[PDB]
Design an enzyme around this catalytic site. Structure first.
Site, PDB file in Angstrom:
ATOM      1  N   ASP A  95       2.820   4.985   4.503  1.00  0.00           N
ATOM      2  CA  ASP A  95       2.571   4.407   6.123  1.00  0.00           C
ATOM      3  C   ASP A  95       2.348   2.952   6.239  1.00  0.00           C
ATOM      4  OD1 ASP A  95       0.195   4.613   4.755  1.00  0.00           O
ATOM      5  OD2 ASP A  95      -0.775   6.093   6.415  1.00  0.00           O
ATOM      6  N   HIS A  96       2.156   2.224   5.187  1.00  0.00           N
ATOM      7  CA  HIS A  96       2.494   0.809   5.368  1.00  0.00           C
ATOM      8  C   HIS A  96       3.718   0.431   4.661  1.00  0.00           C
ATOM      9  CE1 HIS A  96      -2.039  -0.046   5.060  1.00  0.00           C
ATOM     10  NE2 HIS A  96      -1.932   1.040   4.851  1.00  0.00           N
TER      11      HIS A  96
ATOM     12  N   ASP B 176      -2.103  -5.942   5.893  1.00  0.00           N
ATOM     13  CA  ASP B 176      -1.605  -6.421   4.672  1.00  0.00           C
ATOM     14  C   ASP B 176      -1.431  -8.021   4.806  1.00  0.00           C
ATOM     15  OD1 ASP B 176      -1.453  -3.655   3.059  1.00  0.00           O
ATOM     16  OD2 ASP B 176      -0.434  -3.284   5.043  1.00  0.00           O
TER      17      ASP B 176
ATOM     18  N   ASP C 121      -4.079  -5.029   0.886  1.00  0.00           N
ATOM     19  CA  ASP C 121      -4.447  -4.175   2.159  1.00  0.00           C
ATOM     20  C   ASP C 121      -5.939  -4.604   2.462  1.00  0.00           C
ATOM     21  OD1 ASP C 121      -5.377  -2.566   4.339  1.00  0.00           O
ATOM     22  OD2 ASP C 121      -4.635  -0.741   3.440  1.00  0.00           O
TER      23      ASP C 121
ATOM     24  N   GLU D 153      -3.872   1.818  -3.007  1.00  0.00           N
ATOM     25  CA  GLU D 153      -3.911   3.353  -2.854  1.00  0.00           C
ATOM     26  C   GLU D 153      -2.817   3.998  -3.793  1.00  0.00           C
ATOM     27  OE1 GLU D 153      -4.641   3.811   1.746  1.00  0.00           O
ATOM     28  OE2 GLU D 153      -4.955   5.336   0.844  1.00  0.00           O
TER      29      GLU D 153
ATOM     30  N   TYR E  10      -7.743  -3.683  -2.139  1.00  0.00           N
ATOM     31  CA  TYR E  10      -7.565  -2.347  -1.310  1.00  0.00           C
ATOM     32  C   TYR E  10      -9.207  -2.486  -0.571  1.00  0.00           C
ATOM     33  CZ  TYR E  10      -7.387   2.293   0.725  1.00  0.00           C
ATOM     34  OH  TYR E  10      -7.315   3.076   1.526  1.00  0.00           O
TER      35      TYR E  10
ATOM     36  N   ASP F 184       0.278   4.683  -0.522  1.00  0.00           N
ATOM     37  CA  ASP F 184      -0.220   5.734  -0.220  1.00  0.00           C
ATOM     38  C   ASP F 184      -0.019   6.804  -1.068  1.00  0.00           C
ATOM     39  OD1 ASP F 184      -1.758   7.485   1.687  1.00  0.00           O
ATOM     40  OD2 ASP F 184       0.209   8.233   2.431  1.00  0.00           O
TER      41      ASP F 184
ATOM     42  N   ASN G 237       0.767  -1.161   0.045  1.00  0.00           N
ATOM     43  CA  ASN G 237      -0.107   0.046   0.070  1.00  0.00           C
ATOM     44  C   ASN G 237       0.855   1.285   0.006  1.00  0.00           C
ATOM     45  OD1 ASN G 237      -1.162   2.348   1.084  1.00  0.00           O
ATOM     46  ND2 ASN G 237      -3.103   1.120   1.737  1.00  0.00           N
TER      47      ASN G 237
ATOM     48  N   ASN H 248      -7.451  -4.256   5.381  1.00  0.00           N
ATOM     49  CA  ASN H 248      -7.950  -3.338   6.257  1.00  0.00           C
ATOM     50  C   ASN H 248      -8.928  -3.907   7.450  1.00  0.00           C
ATOM     51  OD1 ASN H 248      -9.798  -0.615   6.624  1.00  0.00           O
ATOM     52  ND2 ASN H 248      -7.651  -0.241   6.138  1.00  0.00           N
TER      53      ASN H 248
END
Ligand SMILES: [Mg+2]
Length: 276
Positions: A266-267, A241, A168, A54, A129, A28, A26, A170
């Site tokens: 941030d992942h 993830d 991801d 993302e 995602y 971002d 991911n 989530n």
DNA sequence: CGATGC
């Protein structure tokens, strides 16, 4: 506390050598990630298949650096129809898949550029995602419907060909999968509904959590840290993830890695080794 | 969503 991803195990319980390396990340936002040198890390990792989530980038407005990626020349992308700078996934492969598809065969859930399916000779790869429940459980009703549709779609795929799901998803499945289980039990990503959905997915399809299957009681292994309050420097994180596998692939599983130190999002990336 | 402070 401390997580040090153990060395790469490149042989299965059988004893065959790993033949396929899949990396999921991911990022971002593609452009922010590339400027933070995410592609330099990918080049060093040298995966056979790279899955990105993302991307936040329209399919036709992709950075040019992605052209400059010689060992990942077959590239497929999906992004929201209406939204932009939002969600988006990619699947880049050294060898061409037999067939590509997008979404999970359900128009309501197929509008946000979240899922790519890539069929290969001996397995089918999905990257996803998964929709976020929202700060305060706002879209948690939608997310429970997503979970159900996703589970149904994946059981279908797995009935035809061995399945690898990555990306991801989530949700942190169990308390071991995030640093503060107590404080987050009503927060997006750790509600009992999301966790139960994830557990349903494991047994209904069925699928194995590759990392947790190999490392059942390794704590503090996370793939996401909020930028807020520099949580990553404190290793206050979540494992969001995954690589989930059909049981028939378990004899193929060499290792499932968490690339804790790779920067740029941030992942962090996760990487799968299979002997096929 | 980590920090905060009933
Ligand atoms: Mg994000």
């Amino acid at each position: 506390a401390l997580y040090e991803d153990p060395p790469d195990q490149k042989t299965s319980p059988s004893g065959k050598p790993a033949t396929l390396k899949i990396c999921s990340w991911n990022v971002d936002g593609l452009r922010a990630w590339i400027k933070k040198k995410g592609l330099d890390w990918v080049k060093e990792e040298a995966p056979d298949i790279l899955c990105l989530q993302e991307t936040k980038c329209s399919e036709n407005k992709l950075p040019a650096e992605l052209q400059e990626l010689p060992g990942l020349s077959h590239q497929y992308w999906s992004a929201p129809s209406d939204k932009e700078g939002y969600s988006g996934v990619g699947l880049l492969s050294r060898q061409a898949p037999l067939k590509v598809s997008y979404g999970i065969g359900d128009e309501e859930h197929d509008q946000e550029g979240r899922v790519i399916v890539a069929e290969f000779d001996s397995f089918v790869l999905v990257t996803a995602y998964v929709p976020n429940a929202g700060r305060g459980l706002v879209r948690l009703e939608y997310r429970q419907r997503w979970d159900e549709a996703f589970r149904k779609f994946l059981k279908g795929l797995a009935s035809r060909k061995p399945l690898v799901l990555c990306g991801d998803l989530n949700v942190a499945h169990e308390e071991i999968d995030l640093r503060n289980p107590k404080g987050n039990k009503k927060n997006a990503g750790f509600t009992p509904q999301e966790r139960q959905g994830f557990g349903e997915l494991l047994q209904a399809v069925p699928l194995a959590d590759s990392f947790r299957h190999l490392y059942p009681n390794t704590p503090y292994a996370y793939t996401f840290w909020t930028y807020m309050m520099n949580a990553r420097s404190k290793n206050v994180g979540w494992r969001l993830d995954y690589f989930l596998l059909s049981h028939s692939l378990l004899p193929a599983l060499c290792d499932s890695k968490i690339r804790s130190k790779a920067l740029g999002s941030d992942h962090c990336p996760i990487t799968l080794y299979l002997a096929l």
